[PDB]
Structure formats: structure tokens, C-alpha cells
Design a binder for this molecule. Structure first.
Ligand code: SF4
Ligand SMILES: [Zn+2]
Ligand SMILES: [Zn+2]
Ligand SMILES: [Zn+2]
Lengths: 97, 86, 512, 158, 495, 89
């Protein structure tokens, strides 16, 4: 949350993000903005590139190409809002190697 | 004001108009028979290229007996450009 | 043209295969593209790409053109891929107008794409030697006679011939021969004196080399248009007018092309002397028929001159427009009923009309005419002019006038017919795929008998065929057979409406 | 008559059955007249003139029939015939005649004749796909698919 | 016996391919159909209706009522979409300019692109080059649009194609029958004379006969887009795999899950707090029902088109709640939050929830001078140290230190607060249970939320940041006071 | 140099930044969010994860800083170990 009365946390604003980028602490910036703030694990289908649930893709009615992925909850909300706006982001996953 | 609907409309709503029956006649029957004969005879035609099977399990003596044999038409390379020769 | 692409994909997958239908759909979607990029986009082997291109250009489906740097680009013919479905109708009309010899000639031409006259006559003879029996052999004389008759009647046409390389730029061979078309020898058959007898499939140098023939689909389209106009006038006035217009069209075919607003006018004297003697009709009766057809509010024929007695002309574009309007009103009647058809014809006769005027002229109570109008608007059978009083285009200060746009209506109906045939083909394929197991079972239990029919054929193998569990499945087999038959009949009959709409849309354009 | 009353309106209620009966009777009369003209086969022009039916003639015929009690006018019968034309079953022609038994329009006379349709029902209407109301939502893979269609299923079962 | 299937793969996103969905794909993605305009039931429990808005089958927004599609709570529910069919199509305000461009590019009769064969081949050859960038795509689109607008007649069918522009709001006008100062054309003459019956039955049509250009309503626009050849789709600079021209005109609306539409059950009154998207969707459903009722009852075209335009405007607001061409009488009374408004702005998803977002394990306190500490050291109060914890993994080095911290517990400053076992992820609170036993049963690999002790690296920052030196990582030292102290020599950076 | 590396002096505003950069996510996050998003949806332009802004948005280590290179483990191993000989083949 925002306020202290409602038990709110501090905000790493755009200026803080810029300072971290200038420093180059990539892992620090990641742990701050992704791990410790809005960390979440979603399920994405490798066939259609849509978001699934419980390792199941309702679009293709299959669960072989569905895989877990770490993603910020804010980014997931943005993807959902775009899909509602009809701007469908098709995520093409691949191995980390 | 319009009333509220509890369940969604049917996936296939009924219609009071039905399609007009097909025209009957020896001509239509012969056309149907000819189209069926074409469907049956064009798949075996050399022009009907099938998916080349691959990943054979093993080689056997019955390979020569079960070998599919079919004549292959020779395209006209004079009319066809040179980029299509094997 | 997603419906057209889907229909072409289904037709190619059902007629030639998958590795070829993929290339065909890729071509239809992307236009002209080099072979290397076509293969890179498809993702298959270069040999398979070459085979697909060759088997597609053999049937005159795709063409190759030269561009800068000597590159070759392959472009597919969606129009030809669509006309491919009209083969059964072509065979039927050629069998009706000619004999089984011409029927088999047209069949072989349509099934092989491009072949030589000698080859096609040999194939027809070999196939007719099986039709006939009792040692009677088939000679090539009558087959060549039928072939030259079809040629001079313009049902078969020679393909573009490759120019002589020795005379045209003798030297390095170009990547493509650049086949050209010549109208001089377009319908001139070669003089082949060699003859022979067809074989009965016992299973126990070319003079006309380079001269390939094909089926002239333009002639079949013109003949279908003529038959449609004849049937229309027959249902309208009488069979006498139908015979008269058939004779006029037969006389005009040779002197006119396949695209012209008006045909060459004919005179009463020539029409009379050309009309068959089978009808006891006189010159005054013919003149009366012509002058009463000229006064027809549908404008099938026209005077367009008074010299040489009774000079009259035929209005092909007007006839096609009338046929398209008839098709549209008939489909509206069958889809929404006689009242909606009445409203549609009213709003079509009246170029612009409002709801109150439609009601006053149709005598249809309120709450129904407006509903039918809104249904037609949602289904895209008409458009609103929406003449505004102010440039603000506010609904409360503008008049909405309904108007039926025949061109857009025909295009939408043609797209609907394409998608309907696509859905029917998909349903047939789905039924065949889901019942393939029973189909294979039937094929096996029938091959059990088809084998050893004569050699070592014992009677103890006839009472065990029906003993299997296939007997109760014969009902399902017959149901599938009749369903497939009805689906094929529907697909064939929708082809007539598709042809009508395509001819209308082709004749209503200028191509400037 | 425009603001109130009318031969069709009865107590602020449109007589759909009445107009349908009028249309059916007029079409039957015109069809019988055209059949008699075709059977006469004396001459094409005479056959056409006999198949032609005048507005006053059909009005007197409807009056002699007397289906309803309300008086039907020549303009009412003309509107009924225009509705029949819009229905695609009859054809009207305006000929030049100075004066006669009609004397309605100055110098012009409308003659009606029942005519057969241009072409029979087309092929699109013979398939369930052409008469489907949810045809817009058709798709290969989905809820509405031709493989599991009910329209085509019933059409093949019938 | 057992099939081999991979449990988890280290999948990394490569790139995002944006696109569009057709109505069929929208139906396939959606799970249920929302047709009821109401939200809750008539009973006093006020439960959400079935097949309606706020249904739990499209996610969950309450901690007590779980999702119906997936048997999970709100914290684990990702949400599901729904599809709502519209009686009449409507222009997509986001893609309205794209629709105008496509209409100006393609013909209004044959749906073909206004380009000759040579120009088509040139554009295909220029586009087939690898490494095509967004700027090059936009430049090619501009050039093709200019070259298509230069022409006036079609080379495929021969029909005339006038200018296409925007009139009013969400209405497209095509000047097909334009006024010709020179000899008029037979087409325009026939179009003008075809109003005989119109003028006879309404004299007001003759004075307004002019300016009667074609009105490309959503129906006609979709009918034209559905018949565009696929060969010309690449020429429109639109990826064919991403979407189709028929997708710009929407016939189904995608109602998002309840995670995006949070609902607060205010038991203090007879009402609840709902977002603006829910109200907009309810109004859209109500307008669809009203249009269906008018179609069934046979209403007048004028009011039918009025309702259609009102539905178009409501959809355009639901998409982007800030437009300019809104009529005065059709202007909304209050202000609503659209998707565009939620995305853009200072408190938006890009600037308010992605670039800058709030985190935990952080505090804010007043500073005080203390020269007795090094420049690289910062003082942290015991109160904030007992709250800010660090997860330390139990290893063969600090095993005894972690044991001592656990024995101390959350009360004494040097200690921990929670322990997460290696086998099970169930946290254990040290304030309850035998801390001695918890320390004696510390296995390697467990996590201990130890208190902030000396030697730990800690970030120290001032909210107004000008340069990178406004935030620095120091070493934390615990002190009994309640302020952040640091060497005053480092005040110049923080200012 | 960053302003004049394309041959034309491009400003740092929304009009001069879109011509230089290509990340759809970055262009949408900076300014003209909905406009740029709809334009990208229409063009079907696929956006990579090479930029720092989209890296931060997706929650992956940015390529700049410590993430430009990769680390390897100096484990005791033997590349291309001896293969067991096939007796039957
Ligand atoms: S449900 Fe079947 S019959 Fe109806 S439109 Fe779809 S494919 Fe055609
Ligand atoms: Zn999927
Ligand atoms: Zn859920
Ligand atoms: Zn055009």
C-alpha cells in the first residue's frame, strides 16, 4: 500500500530506477522490482502464446505446451488489460540457454 | 424496458424456414456419380503426390514384396523452367 | 478472400495432396514470389517445392513470369482453382451436347491439365474399349473427328506454345522459355495420319510433340450463361421465345467475344432462315415474337436498328443483371419469407424509400416490416443513404432511405456460397474421417470376395461375409453414403449460383 | 381516410387475413386468365392481350365475389395488385387508351397478368449453410463447427 | 507403467508478438457468456448472478468466495475472460484511424488495393528485404497510402472511388457520387435520378439531394473487410498471422476477469464499490438488450440508429474514456476510468506500476548527524532492525550463529522471526513453540529471517534523486536511538 | 552522437525518440501509450527483450551492467568422455 497508516511500503520511483540503471546493479534492480515487490508465477502456452491457469490452456484445450514463468504481477495485469483492449500479446517462450 | 435473461441464447437457434430440397433428376444423379468417380480416381493419379514416408524401422526380405510401385509422369522440361529439374 | 482461400485449400487437399496444397495456399496468399523464398516460407524440402510447382503448373493453376535479373516468379490463379470445382458440370454439359467420345476427351483433358491430341485420343480409345465388348475395337478416326469438332466449336484450345529457340535469340538459354500465346493456331488441330486400336487392359517419334491442349473454360461459361438465359425466357414467356433466343445466341457466339455490352445485331430474315424447320413458325409470327420481346420490361433484347427488316440485338449484361436480381430475391424469400421478399422487391424497385412508404406500399402492419428491414440491414442486404440536414450527421435531424446495392449484395452472396461449400466439404471430410474405421472394415470384407473371384473360387466363402458383426453396421454405412451423396449434390447445385454471381461480378466491371 | 378509417383498418386493427385473402383471390383469377390465354393459342399478341387483366375488371370481379362487407375501391384493388407485383408474381403494363370502360387515368390504362418466376430456387437455399442465422460465427475449430452442426445433421437425417 | 513428462523448464521469453483476435478466437478464449445486466441476486445474500456480470467463473475478487472455474483462492487465481456478443457491430475507437486508412487504401467495390501490378511487385520486393524495422514499415505505409490516394479509378473492376473522410464521430463518409463541374457521369446521373419515388413521397428530399454521399456503417465496413483478398493484406503493412482486416470491426467484447475489476463489499451500507469498467459493461449489455427489444417490437430507423450510435459511443468510452468529438447532448455527465486512462498517466500501469512500484522490507525515517561513524557506515534503529529481516540460508559456516539467533528469538534484538524448512515451505513463527527445539532441529538448506545485524549491506536513499550518488549501499550498525545516522561528510551527495 | 547517428538531428521528445528507438514497450511507456499500442497491434510488430525498459517490465536481468556477459563454472570434468564401444554394431 501507499500510506503508513495503512502499512504502506516505500516507492522506488523512476528516479530510483534510473539511479540503479546508471549503477548497473542488474540483479539488485531485478530483486527490487520483480522478486520482492510483485513476484508471481504464471502459466503460458507455447503454442498460442496466451496465459493459462493451473498448467492448462483453455484456448487450445491442451496442456503439453504450457510452462511456468516468472513475471511481475503488474506486467500480467498489463497483458490482461491489453487482451481486453484486443491488443493480444503473443508470448513466444524459449529455453534460457 | 427490456426484460433480463438468466440463461444465454441457444448456441443454434431454431428457424421456421427450412432449406429447399435438392433438385432431382438423372442429370444431377449422373453429375454426383461422376464427381464421386473423380474423387476416387484422382487420388491414385500420379499428380496426387502423397506425404513421403520416412523413419523406417528396419529392412526386411519382404521389402521387395511390399514395395509400392507406381508409374511417374515425366514433366515437359522444355516448357518448365530449369529450376524444377531433380 | 479468406473463404476463397479456405475453399481452394480444401479442394487442393482433396484433389492433389498436402505438400502441394500448402504451396498452393501459400501462393494464393502471398502472390508472386521466387521459388527460394517460397520454399523458405513453407519450410519443406526444395524437391517437394519443385514437385508441387510442377504439378500445379501442369494443370494451368499457376504461372511463371520473368522479371529483372532473370528471376522467375510463380503466381497462382485463384480463379482457376475455383473453376476447378466446375468439372462435373463441364463433363455433364459436354456429354449432353456431344457423345461419350467428347465426354471422355474433356474428362482426360481436365484430369491431366495439358496433353497432346494423340495421347488423349489413345486414352479415350483405351477407355472405350472397356465400355464396349464383343471384340469390337476403337479406331482413332471418329475420336479425331470429335476432337476437331470440339476444337472448331471452341470447347478445347491449344496451350501457349514455346517459341522456337533457334529463331528467337539463339544462344544462352534463358531461365524460363517465356511461353507466348498465338491466336492463329489456337484452334488448328495437327494432321496426324497414324491410327491404331485401343487395348482392353490385358496386361500381357511423336508427330504432334509440343502441341498441348486444354479445356476452354470461357466457352463453357458462355454456354452456361446462354442456357440460363434460355431457361429464364422459357419460364417467363414461352418455349418459342426460348428457342428463338437460343438460335440468336448460337448465331452470335461465333461473331462475338465473351465480354461485350451488346452482341452483333441480327436480322429477322437470317434468324428465320437459321431457325430449325421443326417449328411451324412464319415470318410474321417471328416478327411478332421479336417486337413483343423488345417491349419486355426486363430488356432481354433490343431493336438497335431498323435496316434489313427486323433488326434486333440481345442485352447480355441486362440478362445477367436480371438473373442476379432473381437469385437475390429468391434467396431473400427462402431465408426470410414471402413478406420479406415483397419488402425487398419493393425497396429494389423504388430506388429510395422510407419505412412509412414501405408500409403504405406493401400493406404490412407495423412492428414486422421494420423488423424485417433491420434484419436485412444486419445481414447486409441493403444500405442506408442517411441524407443529413446538417454536416453534424446527428440522427435526430437526418433522413434514412433504404437502398439495395446489387453489386455489394452479389459479392456478399458469393462469399456466403463459397463459405457454404467450404463448410459442406469440411463436414464431408469429418464424416469420412470419423467413419473411416467402418469404411476400412467394409473395404476388407469386400476385398475378401474381390480376391480369388475366379481362380480357386469356392462357394464356402459367400455365407461368411455377412456372418461378421458388419451386418448391423450396414445401416450406418448406408446413412453415411446417403449423407455424402446429399452433401455432394448440394455442393454441385450451389455451383450454379456461384457461377451466376461470378459472371455478374465479372461483367459489371471494366478492368480499366 | 389517411388519418382514420380505411378499407383495411377495422377498429384500429389491420386485417392481415383480409389482405391475404384479397391477394390469393386476385392471384388465382390472374392465373386462371393466363391459363385460358395460353390454352387459346390463337396468336401471340391475342394471347398476351387476353392474359392481361384490367384494374377495373379485377375490381368488378372482387366486387362480384364479395368477400367482405366494406366497399373496395378501384384504387384499393390497384394497391393490392401493386403488392402482388412487389411479391414477384404478376406484371403490370401501361398502355395508351384515350377512353373506355375504365376511364381512371387520363389516356393511360394499367393491365396486369400473372407471370411465372424468372428462375427456380437457387442452389444456395438448398443447403443449410445458406439459410443459417448464425452463419457469421461459423469457424473450423470451435463451438459452432460444421463437423458437429445441428442444422446439417437434421437436414441429412431428413 | 509411467510416462515421462518434464516437471518445469527454465523458459525465458524471447519476444512479444502483438496482434488481434477475431470473434471466433474471442469465443474460443472466453469460458462463459455474460448476458445478464444485473450484478447480484434478489436474495438478501446478494450473491452474483449466473451467466452475468461479476460472475465467479471469470475469476474472483473476494477473499471468501473462491473462483468457480479453478478451485483456488484469490491469491492463486489468475482470472478468466468472457465474451459478450453485440447485436450490431461497432467501430473500434483504437483502430478507427486504421479502418479509415484501410478504406482509403482498398476499393469500396471489389475490396482490392488501389495499386497496379508494377507497384504491387515493387512494394513486395521492397518489403521482402530482411531486417524490416518499424520506422521503415510506417514509411512504406505512408508511401503506399499516398500513391493509392493519388489514384481515383480502380484498375481491377473499373468502379469509381472518391475521397473517404471522417464525419461527426465514429462515422465514415465516402464521396462516391461527388459533384462534377464538367460533364457529369452516367453513374452519378442515375444515382441522382433514382430518387424519384423519394421526392414524390417526401419533397424535402429534393432540396437535400446534394451532399448525399455513401455512409460506411460498421455492417458494410465489415462486409468489405471480410472479402479482402489475402494477397493484398501484406500490402497493408499488417501481419497476416497477427490479425485480419475483419478484426478491426468488433462484434464481441472481452470482459476481463474480476482481478482487474476489484469489488469491495461495503457492509456498512446497502451498496458496494465497483470500478467503472463494470458499469460500462452493464450499460453496454443494457443497450444491447434495448436494441434487441426495439428490433423485436419494430421501432423507427431513426431511433434504431440513435441507439446504435449511443452503443458505439459507450464502447468507445469503455475503451478510451477521453474523446473530443463527443456531442454535447451525448456527453457523459460524470468522469469514468477507461483502459487508456488506466494505462497512461502518472499513476498508470507503465509509470505507476511498472517503472516505479512499491516494495517491502523498506522503511522511512528522519536523519540526524553522527560523526563517530565511518563514511561507509549507517546507523539503523533497533525498532526498524527487528522489523526488517534478511533470509539467511543455513550452511556449514553460520550454523551456530543461526542456532544462537533462533534461541534468542524475536524479542531479543539479535535473532530471527521466521524459519522456513527445506522439505516443506510452511513458515514457523519463533514467538510460539519451543525455540530451543527449533534451533536444535535446524537442518542445512533451511531459511531463517534473521534480524538486521552489524555488517549487513543496506541501501540508503533520499526520495528526491538527481544523480546516482543520491542512493548508496552502506554497512548497517544497530543503535538504541530512532533515527538514521551517517557520517556528515556524505551529506553533499544526498544534498 | 546519439542524436546524429542516423544522419539527421533528432530531438529527445516523443517525435524524435520514436524514430531512433524501436521497442514498442518503451515507446508506449514513455508517451502516447494507447496510440503506440494500437499502432503496434495493427502493424503486428514483434518487440524483443533487448531493451532495458522491456527487460525491467518483464522482470528479467537487463543486458546492460552485470548482465552483458555470462559466467561459467570451473568444475572438474572431461569434455567428450570416452564412448562405450558398440559390439553388435
Ligand atoms: S452450424 Fe453448420 S450449417 Fe450452420 S452455418 Fe455453421 S457450418 Fe453451416
Ligand atoms: Zn494454447
Ligand atoms: Zn479463476
Ligand atoms: Zn475496385
Amino acid at each position: 500500500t501507499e500510506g503508513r497508516s495503512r502499512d504502506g511500503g516505500l516507492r522506488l520511483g523512476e528516479m530510483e530506477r534510473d539511479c540503479l540503471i546508471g549503477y548497473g546493479a542488474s540483479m539488485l534492480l531485478l530483486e527490487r522490482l520483480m522478486i520482492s515487490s510483485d513476484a508471481f508465477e504464471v502459466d503460458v502456452c507455447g503454442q498460442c502464446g496466451l496465459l493459462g491457469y493451473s498448467g492448462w490452456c483453455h484456448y487450445c484445450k491442451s496442456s503439453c505446451h504450457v510452462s511456468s514463468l516468472r513475471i511481475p504481477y503488474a506486467c500480467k495485469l498489463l497483458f490482461q488489460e491489453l487482451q481486453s483492449m484486443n491488443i493480444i500479446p503473443r508470448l513466444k517462450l524459449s529455453k534460457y540457454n | 424496458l427490456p426484460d433480463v435473461v438468466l440463461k444465454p441464447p441457444p448456441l443454434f437457434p431454431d428457424t421456421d424456414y427450412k432449406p429447399v430440397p435438392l433438385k432431382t433428376g438423372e442429370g444431377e444423379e449422373y453429375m454426383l456419380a461422376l464427381k464421386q468417380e473423380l474423387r476416387e480416381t484422382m487420388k491414385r493419379m500420379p499428380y496426387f503426390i502423397e506425404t513421403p514416408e520416412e523413419r523406417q524401422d528396419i529392412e526386411r526380405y519382404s521389402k521387395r514384396y511390399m514395395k509400392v510401385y507406381k508409374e511417374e509422369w515425366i514433366p515437359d522440361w522444355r516448357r518448365l523452367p530449369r529450376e524444377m529439374m531433380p | 478472400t479468406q473463404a476463397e482461400i479456405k475453399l481452394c485449400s480444401l479442394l487442393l487437399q482433396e484433389h492433389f495432396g498436402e505438400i502441394v496444397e500448402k504451396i498452393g495456399v501459400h501462393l494464393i496468399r502471398t502472390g508472386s514470389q521466387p521459388l527460394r523464398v517460397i520454399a523458405h516460407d513453407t519450410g519443406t524440402s526444395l524437391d517437394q517445392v519443385k514437385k508441387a510447382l510442377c504439378v500445379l503448373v501442369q494443370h494451368n493453376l499457376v504461372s511463371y513470369q520473368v522479371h529483372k535479373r532473370g528471376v522467375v516468379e510463380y503466381e497462382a490463379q485463384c480463379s482457376r482453382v475455383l473453376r476447378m470445382l466446375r468439372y462435373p458440370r463441364y463433363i455433364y454439359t459436354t456429354k449432353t451436347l456431344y457423345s461419350d467420345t467428347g465426354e471422355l476427351i474433356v474428362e482426360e483433358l481436365l484430369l491431366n491439365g495439358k496433353l497432346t491430341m494423340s495421347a488423349v485420343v489413345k486414352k479415350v480409345a483405351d477407355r472405350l474399349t472397356e465400355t464396349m465388348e464383343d471384340g469390337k475395337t476403337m479406331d482413332y478416326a471418329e475420336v479425331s473427328n470429335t476432337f476437331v469438332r470440339l476444337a472448331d466449336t471452341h470447347f478445347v484450345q491449344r496451350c501457349p506454345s514455346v517459341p522456337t529457340t533457334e529463331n528467337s535469340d539463339p544462344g544462352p538459354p534463358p531461365p524460363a522459355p517465356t511461353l507466348v500465346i498465338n491466336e492463329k493456331d489456337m484452334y488448328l488441330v495437327p494432321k496426324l495420319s497414324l491410327i491404331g486400336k485401343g487395348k482392353r487392359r490385358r496386361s500381357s517419334p511423336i508427330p504432334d510433340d509440343g502441341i498441348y491442349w486444354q479445356a476452354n473454360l470461357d466457352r463453357f461459361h458462355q454456354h452456361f450463361r446462354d442456357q440460363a438465359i434460355v431457361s429464364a425466357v422459357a419460364n417467363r414467356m414461352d418455349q418459342t421465345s426460348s428457342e428463338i433466343v437460343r438460335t440468336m445466341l448460337r448465331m452470335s457466339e461465333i461473331t462475338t467475344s465473351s465480354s461485350a455490352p451488346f452482341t452483333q445485331p441480327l436480322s429477322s430474315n437470317e434468324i428465320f432462315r437459321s431457325l430449325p424447320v421443326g417449328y411451324n413458325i412464319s415470318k410474321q409470327v417471328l416478327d411478332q415474337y421479336l417486337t413483343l420481346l423488345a417491349d419486355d420490361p426486363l430488356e432481354f433484347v433490343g431493336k438497335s436498328g431498323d435496316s434489313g427488316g427486323g433488326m434486333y440485338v440481345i442485352n447480355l449484361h441486362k440478362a445477367l443483371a436480371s438473373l442476379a436480381t432473381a437469385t437475390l430475391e429468391s434467396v431473400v424469400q427462402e431465408r426470410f419469407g414471402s413478406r420479406c421478399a415483397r419488402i425487398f422487391r419493393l425497396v429494389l424497385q423504388k430506388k429510395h424509400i422510407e419505412q412509412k412508404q414501405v408500409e403504405d406500399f406493401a400493406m404490412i402492419p407495423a412492428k414486422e416490416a421494420k423488423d424485417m428491414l433491420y434484419k436485412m440491414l444486419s445481414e447486409n442486404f441493403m444500405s442506408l443513404q442517411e441524407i443529413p440536414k446538417t454536416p453534424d450527421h446527428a440522427p435526430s435531424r437526418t433522413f434514412y432511405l433504404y437502398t439495395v446495392n446489387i453489386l455489394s449484395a452479389a459479392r456478399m452472396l458469393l462469399h456466403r456460397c463459397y463459405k457454404s461449400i467450404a463448410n459442406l466439404i469440411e463436414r464431408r471430410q469429418f464424416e469420412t474421417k470419423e467413419n473411416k474405421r467402418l469404411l476400412e472394415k467394409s473395404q476388407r470384407v469386400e476385398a475378401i470376395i474381390a480376391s480369388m473371384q475366379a481362380t480357386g473360387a469356392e462357394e464356402a466363402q459367400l455365407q461368411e461375409i455377412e456372418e461378421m458383426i458388419t451386418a448391423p453396421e450396414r445401416q450406418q454405412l448406408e446413412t453415411l453414403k446417403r449423407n455424402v451423396n446429399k452433401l455432394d449434390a448440394s455442393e454441385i447445385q450451389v455451383d450454379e449460383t456461384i457461377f451466376l454471381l461470378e459472371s455478374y461480378i465479372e461483367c459489371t466491371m471494366k478492368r480499366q | 381516410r389517411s388519418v382514420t378509417g380505411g378499407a383495411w383498418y377495422s377498429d384500429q386493427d389491420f386485417e392481415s387475413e383480409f389482405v391475404e385473402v384479397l391477394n390469393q383471390q386476385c392471384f388465382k383469377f390472374l392465373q386462371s386468365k393466363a391459363e385460358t390465354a395460353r390454352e387459346s393459342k390463337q396468336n401471340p399478341m391475342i394471347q398476351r392481350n387476353s392474359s392481361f387483366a384490367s384494374s377495373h375488371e379485377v375490381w368488378k370481379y372482387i366486387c362480384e365475389l364479395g368477400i367482405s362487407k366494406v366497399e373496395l375501391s378501384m384504387e384499393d384493388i390497384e394497391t393490392i395488385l401493386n403488392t402482388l407485383i412487389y411479391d414477384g408474381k404478376v406484371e403490370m403494363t401501361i398502355i395508351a387508351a384515350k377512353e373506355g370502360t375504365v376511364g381512371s387515368v387520363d389516356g393511360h390504362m394499367k393491365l396486369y397478368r400473372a407471370v411465372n418466376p424468372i428462375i427456380p430456387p437457387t442452389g444456395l437455399v438448398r443447403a443449410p449453410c445458406g439459410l443459417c442465422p448464425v452463419f457469421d460465427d461459423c469457424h473450423e475449430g470451435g463451438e459452432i463447427s460444421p463437423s458437429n452442426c445441428i442444422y446439417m445433421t437434421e437436414w441429412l437425417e431428413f | 507403467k509411467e510416462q515421462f513428462r518434464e516437471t518445469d523448464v527454465a523458459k525465458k521469453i524471447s519476444h512479444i508478438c502483438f496482434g488481434m483476435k477475431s470473434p471466433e478466437e474471442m469465443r474460443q478464449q472466453a469460458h462463459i457468456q455474460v448476458v445478464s445486466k444485473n450484478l447480484y441476486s434478489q436474495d438478501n445474500q446478494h450473491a452474483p448472478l449466473l451467466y452475468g456480470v461479476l460472475d465467479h467463473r471469470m475469476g474472483t475478487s473476494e477473499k471468501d468466495r473462491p473462483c468457480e472455474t479453478c478451485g483456488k483462492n484469490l491469491a492463486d487465481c489468475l482470472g478468466h475472460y468472457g465474451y459478450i456478443d453485440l447485436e450490431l457491430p461497432c467501430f473500434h475507437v483504437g483502430y478507427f484511424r486504421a479502418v479509415i486508412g484501410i478504406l482509403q487504401m482498398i476499393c469500396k467495390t471489389c475490396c482490392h488495393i488501389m495499386l497496379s501490378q508494377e507497384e504491387k511487385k515493387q512494394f513486395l520486393d521492397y518489403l521482402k528485404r530482411p531486417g524490416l524495422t518499424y520506422l521503415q514499415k510506417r514509411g512504406l505505409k505512408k508511401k503506399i497510402s499516398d500513391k493509392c490516394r493519388k489514384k481515383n479509378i480502380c484498375h481491377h473492376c473499373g468502379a469509381f472511388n472518391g475521397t473517404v473522410k471522417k464525419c461527426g464521430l465514429l462515422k465514415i463518409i465516402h464521396e462516391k457520387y461527388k459533384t462534377n463541374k464538367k460533364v457529369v457521369d452516367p453513374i452519378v446521373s442515375n444515382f441522382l435520378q433514382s430518387f424519384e419515388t423519394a421526392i414524390e413521397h417526401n419533397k424535402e428530399v429534393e432540396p437535400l439531394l446534394g451532399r448525399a454521399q455513401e455512409n460506411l456503417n460498421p455492417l458494410v465496413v465489415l462486409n468489405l473487410f471480410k472479402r479482402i483478398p489475402a494477397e493484398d493484406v501484406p500490402l497493408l503493412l499488417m501481419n497476416p498471422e497477427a490479425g485480419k482486416p475483419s478484426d478491426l470491426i468488433l462484434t464481441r467484447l472481452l470482459v476481463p476477469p474480476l482481478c482487474i475489476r476489484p469489488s469491495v463489499v461495503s457492509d456498512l451500507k446497502s451498496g458496494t464499490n465497483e470500478d467503472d469498467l463494470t458499469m460500462k459493461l452493464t450499460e453496454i449489455i443494457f443497450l444491447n438488450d434495448v436494441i434487441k427489444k426495439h428490433r423485436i417490437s419494430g421501432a423507427k430507423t431513426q431511433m434504431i440508429m440513435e441507439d446504435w450510435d449511443f452503443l458505439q459511443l459507450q464502447c468507445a468510452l469503455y475503451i478510451n474514456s477521453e474523446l473530443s468529438g463527443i456531442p454535447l447532448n451525448m456527453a457523459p455527465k460524470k468522469w469514468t476510468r477507461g483502459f487508456v486512462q488506466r494505462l497512461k498517466g502518472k499513476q498508470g500501469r507503465f509509470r505507476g506500476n511498472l517503472s516505479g512500484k512499491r516494495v517491502d522490507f523498506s522503511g522511512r525515517t528522519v536523519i540526524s548527524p553522527d560523526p563517530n561513524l565511518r563514511i561507509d557506515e549507517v546507523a539503523v534503529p533497533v525498532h526498524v532492525a527487528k522489523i526488517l529481516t534478511f533470509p539467511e540460508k543455513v550452511n556449514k559456516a553460520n550454523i551456530n550463529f543461526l542456532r544462537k539467533l533462533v534461541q534468542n528469538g524475536p524479542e531479543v534484538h539479535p535473532g530471527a522471526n521466521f524459519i522456513q524448512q527445506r522439505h516443506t515451505q510452511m513458515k514457523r513463527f519463533l514467538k510460539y513453540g519451543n525455540r530451543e527445539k527449533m534451533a536444535q532441529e535446524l537442518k542445512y538448506g533451511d531459511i531463517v529471517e534473521r534480524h538486521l545485524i552489524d555488517g549487513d549491506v543496506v541501501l540508503f536513499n533520499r526520495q528526491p534523486s538527481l544523480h546516482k550518488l543520491s542512493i548508496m549501499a552502506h554497512l548497517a550498525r544497530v543503535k538504541p536511538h530512532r533515527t538514521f545516522r551517517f557520517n556528515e561528510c556524505v551529506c553533499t551527495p544526498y544534498n | 552522437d546519439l542524436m546524429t547517428y542516423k544522419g539527421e538531428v533528432l530531438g529527445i521528445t516523443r517525435f524524435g525518440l520514436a524514430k531512433m528507438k524501436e521497442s514498442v514497450l518503451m515507446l508506449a511507456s514513455f508517451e502516447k501509450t494507447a496510440d503506440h499500442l494500437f499502432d503496434a497491434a495493427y502493424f503486428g510488430q514483434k518487440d524483443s527483450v533487448c531493451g532495458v525498459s522491456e527487460c525491467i517490465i518483464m522482470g528479467i536481468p537487463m543486458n546492460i551492467g552485470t548482465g552483458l556477459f555470462k559466467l561459467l563454472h570451473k568444475a572438474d570434468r572431461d569434455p567428450n568422455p570416452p564412448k562405450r564401444p558398440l559390439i553388435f554394431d
